[PDB]
Protein backbone atom coordinates (compact mmCIF):
# COMPACT_ATOMS: atom_id res chain seq x y z
CA UNK A 1 0.00 0.00 0.00
CA UNK A 2 1.32 3.39 1.05
CA UNK A 3 4.68 4.09 2.60
CA UNK A 4 6.83 6.75 4.21
CA UNK A 5 10.48 7.65 4.70
CA UNK A 6 11.31 10.02 7.54
CA UNK A 7 14.51 11.37 9.10
CA UNK A 8 14.43 12.55 12.72
CA UNK A 9 17.10 14.76 14.30
CA UNK A 10 17.60 15.95 17.87
CA UNK A 11 20.35 18.16 19.31
CA UNK A 12 20.42 18.78 23.07
CA UNK A 13 22.78 21.39 24.50
CA UNK A 14 24.61 20.72 27.74
CA UNK A 15 26.49 23.87 28.82
CA UNK A 16 29.69 23.05 30.68
CA UNK A 17 29.57 19.43 29.45
CA UNK A 18 30.93 19.91 25.91
CA UNK A 19 29.02 20.45 22.70
CA UNK A 20 25.36 19.52 22.06
CA UNK A 21 24.71 15.86 21.54
CA UNK A 22 23.27 15.14 18.05
CA UNK A 23 21.24 11.97 17.31
CA UNK A 24 19.54 11.26 13.99
CA UNK A 25 17.62 8.16 12.91
CA UNK A 26 15.95 7.25 9.62
CA UNK A 27 12.80 5.14 9.19
CA UNK A 28 10.92 3.57 6.32
CA UNK A 29 7.39 3.11 7.71
CA UNK A 30 7.96 1.72 11.25
CA UNK A 31 11.37 0.19 10.44
CA UNK A 32 14.54 1.91 11.70
CA UNK A 33 17.21 1.66 9.02
CA UNK A 34 20.03 4.15 9.84
CA UNK A 35 21.38 5.93 12.91
CA UNK A 36 24.09 8.45 13.78
CA UNK A 37 25.08 9.62 17.28
CA UNK A 38 27.75 12.27 17.81
CA UNK A 39 28.63 10.67 21.17
CA UNK A 40 29.64 7.42 19.52
CA UNK A 41 33.38 6.82 19.80
CA UNK A 42 33.72 7.09 15.99
CA UNK A 43 30.53 8.72 14.66
CA UNK A 44 29.40 7.22 11.39
CA UNK A 45 26.01 6.63 10.02
CA UNK A 46 25.33 2.96 10.68
CA UNK A 47 22.91 0.44 9.13
CA UNK A 48 20.07 -0.90 11.23
CA UNK A 49 18.14 -2.98 8.69
CA UNK A 50 19.44 -5.76 6.45
CA UNK A 51 18.27 -4.20 3.16
CA UNK A 52 20.41 -1.06 3.60
CA UNK A 53 23.62 -3.01 4.22
CA UNK A 54 24.12 -3.56 0.49
CA UNK A 55 24.64 0.17 -0.06
CA UNK A 56 28.28 0.71 -0.96
CA UNK A 57 31.03 2.71 0.71
CA UNK A 58 30.21 5.91 -1.19
CA UNK A 59 26.69 5.88 0.29
CA UNK A 60 27.98 5.53 3.86
CA UNK A 61 30.64 8.22 3.31
CA UNK A 62 28.14 10.71 1.86
CA UNK A 63 25.52 9.99 4.55
CA UNK A 64 28.09 10.38 7.31
CA UNK A 65 29.27 13.67 5.83
CA UNK A 66 25.67 14.95 5.74
CA UNK A 67 25.09 13.94 9.37
CA UNK A 68 28.33 15.56 10.58
CA UNK A 69 27.47 18.79 8.75
CA UNK A 70 23.94 18.80 10.20
CA UNK A 71 25.36 18.30 13.72
CA UNK A 72 27.39 21.47 13.16
CA UNK A 73 24.54 23.54 11.76
CA UNK A 74 22.35 22.46 14.69
CA UNK A 75 24.97 23.80 17.08
CA UNK A 76 24.98 27.15 15.27
CA UNK A 77 21.16 27.07 15.32
CA UNK A 78 21.05 26.46 19.08
CA UNK A 79 23.28 29.54 19.52
CA UNK A 80 20.98 31.57 17.23
CA UNK A 81 17.89 30.46 19.13
CA UNK A 82 19.28 31.71 22.45
CA UNK A 83 19.48 35.14 20.83
CA UNK A 84 16.00 34.92 19.27
CA UNK A 85 14.41 34.06 22.65
CA UNK A 86 16.65 36.32 24.78
CA UNK A 87 17.85 33.29 26.74
CA UNK A 88 20.92 32.84 28.86
CA UNK A 89 23.73 30.48 27.88
CA UNK A 90 23.37 28.49 31.10
CA UNK A 91 20.54 26.03 30.36
CA UNK A 92 19.97 22.94 28.24
CA UNK A 93 17.83 23.43 25.10
CA UNK A 94 16.51 21.09 22.41
CA UNK A 95 16.31 21.44 18.63
CA UNK A 96 14.35 18.83 16.67
CA UNK A 97 13.75 18.46 12.94
CA UNK A 98 11.81 15.90 10.93
CA UNK A 99 11.57 15.68 7.17
CA UNK A 100 10.52 13.09 4.61
CA UNK A 101 7.89 11.90 2.22
CA UNK A 102 4.72 9.75 2.07
CA UNK A 103 3.93 7.87 -1.16
CA UNK A 104 0.95 5.88 -2.35
CA UNK A 105 0.86 2.36 -3.76
CA UNK A 106 2.04 3.60 -7.14
CA UNK A 107 5.02 5.36 -5.55
CA UNK A 108 4.02 8.96 -6.29
CA UNK A 109 4.43 11.71 -3.68
CA UNK A 110 1.36 12.04 -1.44
CA UNK A 111 2.77 14.54 1.11
CA UNK A 112 6.19 15.94 2.05
CA UNK A 113 7.35 17.34 5.38
CA UNK A 114 10.13 19.48 6.80
CA UNK A 115 9.54 20.90 10.28
CA UNK A 116 11.38 22.10 13.35
CA UNK A 117 10.64 22.36 17.07
CA UNK A 118 12.60 24.25 19.75
CA UNK A 119 12.32 23.20 23.38
CA UNK A 120 9.55 20.78 22.48
CA UNK A 121 7.36 23.44 20.79
CA UNK A 122 6.57 23.84 17.11
CA UNK A 123 8.97 26.40 15.65
CA UNK A 124 8.64 26.51 11.82
CA UNK A 125 7.11 24.02 9.35
CA UNK A 126 7.06 23.78 5.58
CA UNK A 127 3.39 23.79 4.59
CA UNK A 128 1.81 20.98 2.58
CA UNK A 129 2.26 23.09 -0.58
CA UNK A 130 6.05 22.65 -0.21
CA UNK A 131 6.29 26.34 -1.03
CA UNK A 132 5.29 28.46 2.01
CA UNK A 133 6.00 28.38 5.75
CA UNK A 134 4.10 28.39 9.04
CA UNK A 135 6.09 30.15 11.79
CA UNK A 136 4.87 29.56 15.36
CA UNK A 137 5.99 32.90 16.80
CA UNK A 138 7.91 36.09 16.06
CA UNK A 139 11.28 34.35 16.46
CA UNK A 140 10.38 31.75 13.85
CA UNK A 141 9.24 34.66 11.59
CA UNK A 142 12.89 35.80 11.57
CA UNK A 143 13.85 32.36 10.28
CA UNK A 144 10.94 32.48 7.78
CA UNK A 145 12.22 35.77 6.35
CA UNK A 146 15.71 34.28 5.92
CA UNK A 147 14.36 31.12 4.31
CA UNK A 148 12.06 33.08 1.96
CA UNK A 149 15.00 35.29 0.92
CA UNK A 150 17.16 32.24 0.18
CA UNK A 151 14.35 30.27 -1.58
CA UNK A 152 14.88 27.34 0.81
CA UNK A 153 11.41 25.93 0.13
CA UNK A 154 12.14 25.43 -3.58
CA UNK A 155 15.17 23.33 -2.74
CA UNK A 156 13.21 21.29 -0.21
CA UNK A 157 10.40 20.73 -2.69
CA UNK A 158 12.92 19.45 -5.25
CA UNK A 159 14.30 16.94 -2.75
CA UNK A 160 10.94 15.82 -1.36
CA UNK A 161 9.32 15.25 -4.75
CA UNK A 162 12.50 13.84 -6.34
CA UNK A 163 15.29 12.17 -4.41
CA UNK A 164 13.13 11.40 -1.36
CA UNK A 165 10.55 9.43 -3.38
CA UNK A 166 13.27 7.73 -5.48
CA UNK A 167 15.17 6.57 -2.42
CA UNK A 168 11.95 5.28 -0.88
CA UNK A 169 11.15 3.34 -4.06
CA UNK A 170 14.64 1.78 -4.02
CA UNK A 171 14.43 0.85 -0.35
CA UNK A 172 10.95 -0.66 -0.76
CA UNK A 173 12.29 -2.91 -3.55
CA UNK A 174 15.50 -3.87 -1.73
CA UNK A 175 13.49 -4.46 1.47
CA UNK A 176 10.47 -6.09 -0.21
CA UNK A 177 10.66 -9.18 2.03
CA UNK A 178 9.93 -7.10 5.16
CA UNK A 179 8.87 -3.53 4.23
CA UNK A 180 6.14 -5.01 2.03
CA UNK A 181 4.93 -7.59 4.56
CA UNK A 182 2.20 -6.79 7.10
CA UNK A 183 2.19 -9.14 10.10
CA UNK A 184 -1.38 -9.32 11.49
CA UNK A 185 -2.00 -9.10 15.22
CA UNK A 186 -2.32 -12.26 17.25
CA UNK A 187 -5.37 -11.50 19.37
CA UNK A 188 -7.02 -12.84 22.52
CA UNK A 189 -9.09 -11.68 25.50
CA UNK A 190 -8.12 -12.19 29.13
CA UNK A 191 -10.26 -11.82 32.25
CA UNK A 192 -8.94 -10.35 35.53
CA UNK A 193 -11.24 -10.35 38.58
CA UNK A 194 -11.18 -7.09 40.54
CA UNK A 195 -13.80 -7.79 43.20
CA UNK A 196 -16.98 -9.77 43.61
CA UNK A 197 -18.71 -7.08 41.51
CA UNK A 198 -16.48 -6.59 38.49
CA UNK A 199 -13.55 -7.84 36.41
CA UNK A 200 -11.30 -6.41 33.74
CA UNK A 201 -11.58 -7.72 30.20
CA UNK A 202 -8.32 -7.04 28.34
CA UNK A 203 -8.16 -7.39 24.56
CA UNK A 204 -4.63 -8.04 23.29
CA UNK A 205 -2.99 -7.50 19.94
CA UNK A 206 0.53 -8.92 19.69
CA UNK A 207 3.22 -9.45 17.05
CA UNK A 208 1.84 -6.99 14.47
CA UNK A 209 3.57 -4.82 11.87
CA UNK A 210 3.17 -1.99 10.94
CA UNK A 211 2.27 -0.18 14.16
CA UNK A 212 -1.05 1.38 13.03
CA UNK A 213 -3.98 -0.55 14.54
CA UNK A 214 -7.44 0.10 15.96
CA UNK A 215 -8.64 -1.78 19.07
CA UNK A 216 -12.01 -0.98 20.55
CA UNK A 217 -14.52 -2.44 22.96
CA UNK A 218 -18.28 -2.40 22.43
CA UNK A 219 -21.00 -3.22 24.97
CA UNK A 220 -24.36 -4.20 23.41
CA UNK A 221 -22.91 -2.81 20.17
CA UNK A 222 -22.04 0.64 21.61
CA UNK A 223 -18.43 1.84 21.55
CA UNK A 224 -17.03 2.22 25.07
CA UNK A 225 -14.56 4.99 24.33
CA UNK A 226 -14.76 6.87 27.63
CA UNK A 227 -14.57 3.64 29.64
CA UNK A 228 -11.74 1.91 27.79
CA UNK A 229 -8.15 2.01 28.95
CA UNK A 230 -6.10 2.00 25.74
CA UNK A 231 -2.32 1.75 26.19
CA UNK A 232 0.09 3.34 23.74
CA UNK A 233 1.24 1.00 20.97
CA UNK A 234 4.60 -0.34 22.12
CA UNK A 235 7.60 -2.05 20.46
CA UNK A 236 8.24 -5.73 21.21
CA UNK A 237 11.90 -5.50 20.09
CA UNK A 238 11.56 -8.08 17.21
CA UNK A 239 10.24 -5.42 14.70
CA UNK A 240 6.64 -5.95 15.82
CA UNK A 241 4.32 -4.01 18.10
CA UNK A 242 1.85 -4.72 20.89
CA UNK A 243 -1.28 -3.00 22.19
CA UNK A 244 -4.14 -3.77 24.55
CA UNK A 245 -7.51 -2.23 25.43
CA UNK A 246 -9.27 -2.92 28.73
CA UNK A 247 -12.77 -2.39 30.13
CA UNK A 248 -14.15 -2.92 33.64
CA UNK A 249 -17.07 -5.28 33.31
CA UNK A 250 -19.80 -5.98 35.92
CA UNK A 251 -20.02 -9.60 37.03
CA UNK A 252 -22.01 -11.70 34.60
CA UNK A 253 -21.97 -9.10 31.79
CA UNK A 254 -18.95 -10.49 29.95
CA UNK A 255 -20.78 -11.77 26.89
CA UNK A 256 -22.24 -8.30 26.22
CA UNK A 257 -18.72 -7.02 25.44
CA UNK A 258 -16.96 -7.49 22.10
CA UNK A 259 -13.48 -6.41 21.10
CA UNK A 260 -12.91 -5.14 17.54
CA UNK A 261 -9.57 -5.19 15.77
CA UNK A 262 -8.54 -3.47 12.54
CA UNK A 263 -5.10 -3.85 11.01
CA UNK A 264 -3.81 -3.73 7.48
CA UNK A 265 -2.63 -7.37 7.83
CA UNK A 266 -6.24 -8.51 8.44
CA UNK A 267 -8.43 -9.00 5.35
CA UNK A 268 -11.51 -8.38 7.51
CA UNK A 269 -11.75 -6.75 10.94
CA UNK A 270 -11.93 -9.21 13.82
CA UNK A 271 -14.52 -9.47 16.58
CA UNK A 272 -13.54 -11.29 19.80
CA UNK A 273 -15.19 -12.15 23.09
CA UNK A 274 -14.01 -13.59 26.36
CA UNK A 275 -13.98 -17.40 26.08
CA UNK A 276 -14.10 -18.95 29.58
Amino acid sequence: GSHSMRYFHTSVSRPGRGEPRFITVGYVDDTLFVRFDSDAASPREEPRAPWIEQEGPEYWDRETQICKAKAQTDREDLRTLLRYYNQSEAGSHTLQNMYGCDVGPDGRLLRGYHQHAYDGKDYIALNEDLSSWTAADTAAQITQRKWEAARVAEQLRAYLEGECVEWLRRYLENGKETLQRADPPKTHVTHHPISDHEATLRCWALGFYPAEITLTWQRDGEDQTQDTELVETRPAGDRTFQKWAAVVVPSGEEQRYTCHVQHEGLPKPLTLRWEP
Binding site: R62, I66, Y84, H116, K146, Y159
Partner: peptide, 9 residues
Protein backbone atom coordinates in the same frame (compact mmCIF):
# COMPACT_ATOMS: atom_id res chain seq x y z
CA UNK B 1 19.12 8.88 1.48
CA UNK B 2 19.30 12.29 3.19
CA UNK B 3 18.79 15.87 2.11
CA UNK B 4 22.16 17.59 1.46
CA UNK B 5 21.14 21.22 1.73
CA UNK B 6 22.56 23.25 4.60
CA UNK B 7 19.71 25.16 6.28
CA UNK B 8 20.29 27.46 9.28
CA UNK B 9 17.62 29.13 11.40
Amino acid sequence: GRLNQPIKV
